[PDB]
Amino acid sequence: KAIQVAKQVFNTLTEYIQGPCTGNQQSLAHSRLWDAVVGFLHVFAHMQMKLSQDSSQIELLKELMDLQKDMVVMLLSMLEGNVVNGTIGKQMVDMLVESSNNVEMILKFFDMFLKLKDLTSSDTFKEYDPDGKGVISKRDFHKAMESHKHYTQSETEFLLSCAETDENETLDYEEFVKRFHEPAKDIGFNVAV
């Protein structure tokens, strides 16, 4: 419910400053919006890191990335009509440097799940050819990932912990459908923009 209310508020702010209004843009520039945005990215990064595990918080994660997309759309709507070395750009870069750790966290999360290093490596298919679908022998996943992905627990073992799925040894492409691939592509596209 809180995510839905925040989404509606962000949509209202966008429709306030979707068109070039200048006065409204300056009004929200000289306000407390930047602190709220910084806190929002902080809770986004930490909640994404905490909820990357488990298997019951998928819908909350979906609404979470949806609110992320809405805020990034709003932020892009701020930069409409900017020039080189604009004041809005200065406020923007101040906002980034005020929350550098959260930005690094969300970027690291986006790089691991989708945005290369996932659904691109195609583990054991182009590297081992398991004579079938992407069932994977569980231990084959750790036997894989000898690539550009880091060996840290937050990079290699992170995927293993997040992709527990079945009990004994079986995985599937449904893991790639649920985590990474379809999410974090459209959501991260606005961040890249």
PDB file of C-alpha atoms in Angstrom:
ATOM      1  CA  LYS A   1       0.000   0.000   0.000  1.00  0.00           C
ATOM      2  CA  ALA A   2       2.849   2.407   0.790  1.00  0.00           C
ATOM      3  CA  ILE A   3       4.498   1.619  -2.561  1.00  0.00           C
ATOM      4  CA  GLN A   4       1.206   2.253  -4.373  1.00  0.00           C
ATOM      5  CA  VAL A   5       0.735   5.607  -2.624  1.00  0.00           C
ATOM      6  CA  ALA A   6       4.329   6.602  -3.413  1.00  0.00           C
ATOM      7  CA  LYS A   7       3.816   5.602  -7.057  1.00  0.00           C
ATOM      8  CA  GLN A   8       0.698   7.768  -7.285  1.00  0.00           C
ATOM      9  CA  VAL A   9       2.502  10.720  -5.673  1.00  0.00           C
ATOM     10  CA  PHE A  10       5.425  10.347  -8.087  1.00  0.00           C
ATOM     11  CA  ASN A  11       3.058  10.160 -11.070  1.00  0.00           C
ATOM     12  CA  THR A  12       1.339  13.328  -9.849  1.00  0.00           C
ATOM     13  CA  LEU A  13       4.716  15.073  -9.606  1.00  0.00           C
ATOM     14  CA  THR A  14       5.634  13.917 -13.124  1.00  0.00           C
ATOM     15  CA  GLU A  15       2.376  15.239 -14.564  1.00  0.00           C
ATOM     16  CA  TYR A  16       3.141  18.453 -12.685  1.00  0.00           C
ATOM     17  CA  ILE A  17       6.494  18.789 -14.460  1.00  0.00           C
ATOM     18  CA  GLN A  18       6.174  16.533 -17.513  1.00  0.00           C
ATOM     19  CA  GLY A  19       5.849  19.518 -19.824  1.00  0.00           C
ATOM     20  CA  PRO A  20       8.411  22.315 -19.723  1.00  0.00           C
ATOM     21  CA  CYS A  21       7.036  24.536 -16.959  1.00  0.00           C
ATOM     22  CA  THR A  22      10.269  26.224 -15.733  1.00  0.00           C
ATOM     23  CA  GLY A  23       8.594  27.768 -12.685  1.00  0.00           C
ATOM     24  CA  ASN A  24       7.473  24.423 -11.276  1.00  0.00           C
ATOM     25  CA  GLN A  25      10.889  22.930 -12.053  1.00  0.00           C
ATOM     26  CA  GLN A  26      12.590  25.700 -10.070  1.00  0.00           C
ATOM     27  CA  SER A  27      10.023  25.300  -7.277  1.00  0.00           C
ATOM     28  CA  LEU A  28      10.819  21.610  -6.827  1.00  0.00           C
ATOM     29  CA  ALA A  29      14.520  22.401  -7.276  1.00  0.00           C
ATOM     30  CA  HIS A  30      14.401  24.754  -4.270  1.00  0.00           C
ATOM     31  CA  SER A  31      12.646  22.293  -1.967  1.00  0.00           C
ATOM     32  CA  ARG A  32      13.208  19.183   0.163  1.00  0.00           C
ATOM     33  CA  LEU A  33      12.809  16.821  -2.810  1.00  0.00           C
ATOM     34  CA  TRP A  34      16.495  15.860  -2.985  1.00  0.00           C
ATOM     35  CA  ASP A  35      16.604  14.535   0.590  1.00  0.00           C
ATOM     36  CA  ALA A  36      13.502  12.409  -0.011  1.00  0.00           C
ATOM     37  CA  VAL A  37      15.035  11.097  -3.242  1.00  0.00           C
ATOM     38  CA  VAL A  38      18.291  10.209  -1.455  1.00  0.00           C
ATOM     39  CA  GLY A  39      16.444   8.365   1.302  1.00  0.00           C
ATOM     40  CA  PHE A  40      14.366   6.605  -1.344  1.00  0.00           C
ATOM     41  CA  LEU A  41      17.448   5.322  -3.171  1.00  0.00           C
ATOM     42  CA  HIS A  42      18.912   4.216   0.165  1.00  0.00           C
ATOM     43  CA  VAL A  43      15.854   2.142   1.069  1.00  0.00           C
ATOM     44  CA  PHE A  44      15.675   0.881  -2.530  1.00  0.00           C
ATOM     45  CA  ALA A  45      19.261  -0.402  -2.489  1.00  0.00           C
ATOM     46  CA  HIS A  46      19.011  -1.964   0.957  1.00  0.00           C
ATOM     47  CA  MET A  47      15.569  -3.514   0.384  1.00  0.00           C
ATOM     48  CA  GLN A  48      16.675  -4.964  -2.960  1.00  0.00           C
ATOM     49  CA  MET A  49      19.777  -6.440  -1.316  1.00  0.00           C
ATOM     50  CA  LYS A  50      17.719  -7.885   1.549  1.00  0.00           C
ATOM     51  CA  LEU A  51      14.887  -9.232  -0.632  1.00  0.00           C
ATOM     52  CA  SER A  52      17.115 -10.713  -3.345  1.00  0.00           C
ATOM     53  CA  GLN A  53      16.910 -13.960  -1.348  1.00  0.00           C
ATOM     54  CA  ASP A  54      13.771 -15.958  -0.419  1.00  0.00           C
ATOM     55  CA  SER A  55      10.925 -16.888  -2.769  1.00  0.00           C
ATOM     56  CA  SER A  56       7.760 -15.307  -1.302  1.00  0.00           C
ATOM     57  CA  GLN A  57       8.573 -11.587  -1.721  1.00  0.00           C
ATOM     58  CA  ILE A  58       8.512 -11.607  -5.534  1.00  0.00           C
ATOM     59  CA  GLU A  59       5.440  -9.365  -5.844  1.00  0.00           C
ATOM     60  CA  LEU A  60       6.831  -6.849  -3.355  1.00  0.00           C
ATOM     61  CA  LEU A  61      10.091  -6.841  -5.320  1.00  0.00           C
ATOM     62  CA  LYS A  62       8.150  -6.237  -8.546  1.00  0.00           C
ATOM     63  CA  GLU A  63       6.333  -3.248  -7.038  1.00  0.00           C
ATOM     64  CA  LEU A  64       9.700  -2.120  -5.630  1.00  0.00           C
ATOM     65  CA  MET A  65      11.334  -1.981  -9.066  1.00  0.00           C
ATOM     66  CA  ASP A  66       8.154  -0.359 -10.411  1.00  0.00           C
ATOM     67  CA  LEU A  67       8.512   2.484  -7.903  1.00  0.00           C
ATOM     68  CA  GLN A  68      12.198   2.720  -8.844  1.00  0.00           C
ATOM     69  CA  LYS A  69      11.207   3.125 -12.504  1.00  0.00           C
ATOM     70  CA  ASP A  70       8.643   5.779 -11.569  1.00  0.00           C
ATOM     71  CA  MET A  71      11.175   7.809  -9.579  1.00  0.00           C
ATOM     72  CA  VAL A  72      13.751   7.618 -12.380  1.00  0.00           C
ATOM     73  CA  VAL A  73      11.073   8.761 -14.847  1.00  0.00           C
ATOM     74  CA  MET A  74      10.350  11.701 -12.533  1.00  0.00           C
ATOM     75  CA  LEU A  75      14.061  12.545 -12.268  1.00  0.00           C
ATOM     76  CA  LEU A  76      14.408  12.472 -16.057  1.00  0.00           C
ATOM     77  CA  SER A  77      11.358  14.738 -16.254  1.00  0.00           C
ATOM     78  CA  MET A  78      13.305  17.200 -14.100  1.00  0.00           C
ATOM     79  CA  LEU A  79      16.133  17.390 -16.653  1.00  0.00           C
ATOM     80  CA  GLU A  80      13.742  18.282 -19.492  1.00  0.00           C
ATOM     81  CA  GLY A  81      14.864  21.542 -21.078  1.00  0.00           C
ATOM     82  CA  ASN A  82      18.306  21.596 -19.459  1.00  0.00           C
ATOM     83  CA  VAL A  83      21.426  23.127 -20.990  1.00  0.00           C
ATOM     84  CA  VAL A  84      25.124  22.358 -20.576  1.00  0.00           C
ATOM     85  CA  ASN A  85      26.397  23.154 -17.059  1.00  0.00           C
ATOM     86  CA  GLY A  86      22.848  23.741 -15.871  1.00  0.00           C
ATOM     87  CA  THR A  87      21.954  24.309 -12.241  1.00  0.00           C
ATOM     88  CA  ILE A  88      19.634  21.288 -12.312  1.00  0.00           C
ATOM     89  CA  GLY A  89      22.666  19.217 -13.281  1.00  0.00           C
ATOM     90  CA  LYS A  90      24.560  20.585 -10.279  1.00  0.00           C
ATOM     91  CA  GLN A  91      21.707  19.652  -7.942  1.00  0.00           C
ATOM     92  CA  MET A  92      21.579  16.257  -9.659  1.00  0.00           C
ATOM     93  CA  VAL A  93      25.270  15.451  -9.186  1.00  0.00           C
ATOM     94  CA  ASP A  94      25.062  16.679  -5.585  1.00  0.00           C
ATOM     95  CA  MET A  95      22.194  14.218  -5.118  1.00  0.00           C
ATOM     96  CA  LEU A  96      24.270  11.361  -6.588  1.00  0.00           C
ATOM     97  CA  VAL A  97      27.305  12.121  -4.430  1.00  0.00           C
ATOM     98  CA  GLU A  98      25.126  12.403  -1.317  1.00  0.00           C
ATOM     99  CA  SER A  99      24.158   8.719  -1.780  1.00  0.00           C
ATOM    100  CA  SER A 100      27.187   7.186  -3.497  1.00  0.00           C
ATOM    101  CA  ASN A 101      27.021   3.930  -1.517  1.00  0.00           C
ATOM    102  CA  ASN A 102      23.383   3.292  -2.456  1.00  0.00           C
ATOM    103  CA  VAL A 103      24.125   4.023  -6.124  1.00  0.00           C
ATOM    104  CA  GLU A 104      27.037   1.574  -6.031  1.00  0.00           C
ATOM    105  CA  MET A 105      24.780  -1.019  -4.385  1.00  0.00           C
ATOM    106  CA  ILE A 106      22.004  -0.748  -6.976  1.00  0.00           C
ATOM    107  CA  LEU A 107      24.534  -0.767  -9.827  1.00  0.00           C
ATOM    108  CA  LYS A 108      26.196  -3.911  -8.452  1.00  0.00           C
ATOM    109  CA  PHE A 109      22.782  -5.551  -8.048  1.00  0.00           C
ATOM    110  CA  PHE A 110      21.792  -4.618 -11.608  1.00  0.00           C
ATOM    111  CA  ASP A 111      25.054  -5.957 -13.047  1.00  0.00           C
ATOM    112  CA  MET A 112      24.747  -9.335 -11.308  1.00  0.00           C
ATOM    113  CA  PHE A 113      21.098 -10.110 -12.105  1.00  0.00           C
ATOM    114  CA  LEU A 114      20.602  -9.316 -15.819  1.00  0.00           C
ATOM    115  CA  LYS A 115      22.391  -6.495 -17.672  1.00  0.00           C
ATOM    116  CA  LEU A 116      25.012  -8.997 -18.871  1.00  0.00           C
ATOM    117  CA  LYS A 117      26.494 -11.747 -16.642  1.00  0.00           C
ATOM    118  CA  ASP A 118      23.025 -13.378 -16.625  1.00  0.00           C
ATOM    119  CA  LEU A 119      20.975 -14.875 -19.491  1.00  0.00           C
ATOM    120  CA  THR A 120      24.083 -14.034 -21.556  1.00  0.00           C
ATOM    121  CA  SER A 121      26.651 -16.488 -20.199  1.00  0.00           C
ATOM    122  CA  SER A 122      24.116 -19.337 -20.612  1.00  0.00           C
ATOM    123  CA  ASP A 123      25.924 -21.496 -18.086  1.00  0.00           C
ATOM    124  CA  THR A 124      26.789 -25.097 -19.090  1.00  0.00           C
ATOM    125  CA  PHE A 125      24.995 -24.689 -22.454  1.00  0.00           C
ATOM    126  CA  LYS A 126      27.672 -22.975 -24.556  1.00  0.00           C
ATOM    127  CA  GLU A 127      30.346 -24.133 -22.078  1.00  0.00           C
ATOM    128  CA  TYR A 128      29.370 -27.709 -21.125  1.00  0.00           C
ATOM    129  CA  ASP A 129      26.425 -28.787 -23.377  1.00  0.00           C
ATOM    130  CA  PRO A 130      24.389 -30.768 -20.813  1.00  0.00           C
ATOM    131  CA  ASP A 131      22.392 -32.645 -23.510  1.00  0.00           C
ATOM    132  CA  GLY A 132      19.026 -31.147 -22.644  1.00  0.00           C
ATOM    133  CA  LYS A 133      17.394 -28.058 -21.189  1.00  0.00           C
ATOM    134  CA  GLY A 134      18.839 -25.841 -18.459  1.00  0.00           C
ATOM    135  CA  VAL A 135      18.088 -28.318 -15.680  1.00  0.00           C
ATOM    136  CA  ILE A 136      21.610 -27.989 -14.162  1.00  0.00           C
ATOM    137  CA  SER A 137      23.023 -30.389 -11.549  1.00  0.00           C
ATOM    138  CA  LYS A 138      23.098 -27.702  -8.799  1.00  0.00           C
ATOM    139  CA  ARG A 139      26.824 -28.237  -8.214  1.00  0.00           C
ATOM    140  CA  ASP A 140      27.348 -27.564 -11.934  1.00  0.00           C
ATOM    141  CA  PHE A 141      26.374 -23.932 -11.304  1.00  0.00           C
ATOM    142  CA  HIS A 142      29.316 -23.513  -8.929  1.00  0.00           C
ATOM    143  CA  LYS A 143      31.417 -25.592 -11.328  1.00  0.00           C
ATOM    144  CA  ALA A 144      30.396 -22.944 -13.868  1.00  0.00           C
ATOM    145  CA  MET A 145      30.853 -19.173 -13.374  1.00  0.00           C
ATOM    146  CA  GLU A 146      34.608 -19.187 -14.016  1.00  0.00           C
ATOM    147  CA  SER A 147      34.066 -15.989 -16.031  1.00  0.00           C
ATOM    148  CA  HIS A 148      34.137 -12.197 -15.613  1.00  0.00           C
ATOM    149  CA  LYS A 149      31.674 -12.531 -12.715  1.00  0.00           C
ATOM    150  CA  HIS A 150      33.514 -12.125  -9.424  1.00  0.00           C
ATOM    151  CA  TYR A 151      34.120 -15.054  -7.082  1.00  0.00           C
ATOM    152  CA  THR A 152      32.774 -13.140  -4.073  1.00  0.00           C
ATOM    153  CA  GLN A 153      29.753 -14.413  -2.164  1.00  0.00           C
ATOM    154  CA  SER A 154      27.862 -11.294  -3.289  1.00  0.00           C
ATOM    155  CA  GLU A 155      28.617 -12.150  -6.943  1.00  0.00           C
ATOM    156  CA  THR A 156      28.981 -15.927  -7.390  1.00  0.00           C
ATOM    157  CA  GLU A 157      27.376 -17.396  -4.261  1.00  0.00           C
ATOM    158  CA  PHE A 158      24.714 -14.664  -4.412  1.00  0.00           C
ATOM    159  CA  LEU A 159      23.109 -16.306  -7.447  1.00  0.00           C
ATOM    160  CA  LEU A 160      23.356 -19.742  -5.817  1.00  0.00           C
ATOM    161  CA  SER A 161      21.625 -18.470  -2.671  1.00  0.00           C
ATOM    162  CA  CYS A 162      18.940 -16.620  -4.643  1.00  0.00           C
ATOM    163  CA  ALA A 163      18.300 -19.574  -6.995  1.00  0.00           C
ATOM    164  CA  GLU A 164      17.633 -22.304  -4.416  1.00  0.00           C
ATOM    165  CA  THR A 165      14.244 -23.098  -6.030  1.00  0.00           C
ATOM    166  CA  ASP A 166      13.862 -26.883  -5.996  1.00  0.00           C
ATOM    167  CA  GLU A 167      15.160 -29.036  -3.162  1.00  0.00           C
ATOM    168  CA  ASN A 168      17.466 -31.795  -4.401  1.00  0.00           C
ATOM    169  CA  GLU A 169      19.532 -30.613  -7.372  1.00  0.00           C
ATOM    170  CA  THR A 170      17.291 -29.199 -10.126  1.00  0.00           C
ATOM    171  CA  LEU A 171      17.071 -25.675 -11.549  1.00  0.00           C
ATOM    172  CA  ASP A 172      15.459 -24.318 -14.719  1.00  0.00           C
ATOM    173  CA  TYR A 173      15.108 -21.293 -16.978  1.00  0.00           C
ATOM    174  CA  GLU A 174      12.187 -20.217 -14.774  1.00  0.00           C
ATOM    175  CA  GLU A 175      14.868 -18.848 -12.447  1.00  0.00           C
ATOM    176  CA  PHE A 176      16.098 -16.667 -15.318  1.00  0.00           C
ATOM    177  CA  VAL A 177      12.506 -15.612 -16.017  1.00  0.00           C
ATOM    178  CA  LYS A 178      11.786 -14.716 -12.380  1.00  0.00           C
ATOM    179  CA  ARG A 179      15.080 -13.122 -11.342  1.00  0.00           C
ATOM    180  CA  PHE A 180      16.998 -11.131 -13.972  1.00  0.00           C
ATOM    181  CA  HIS A 181      16.236 -11.081 -17.724  1.00  0.00           C
ATOM    182  CA  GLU A 182      12.644  -9.805 -17.839  1.00  0.00           C
ATOM    183  CA  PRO A 183      12.996  -7.636 -14.703  1.00  0.00           C
ATOM    184  CA  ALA A 184      16.051  -5.387 -14.233  1.00  0.00           C
ATOM    185  CA  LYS A 185      16.150  -4.805 -18.019  1.00  0.00           C
ATOM    186  CA  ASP A 186      13.312  -2.308 -18.425  1.00  0.00           C
ATOM    187  CA  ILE A 187      13.923  -1.052 -14.877  1.00  0.00           C
ATOM    188  CA  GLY A 188      17.658  -0.571 -15.402  1.00  0.00           C
ATOM    189  CA  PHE A 189      17.135   0.954 -18.842  1.00  0.00           C
ATOM    190  CA  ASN A 190      15.824   4.167 -17.281  1.00  0.00           C
ATOM    191  CA  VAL A 191      18.856   4.240 -14.969  1.00  0.00           C
ATOM    192  CA  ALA A 192      21.141   3.872 -17.993  1.00  0.00           C
ATOM    193  CA  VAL A 193      19.236   6.663 -19.767  1.00  0.00           C
TER     194      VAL A 193
END
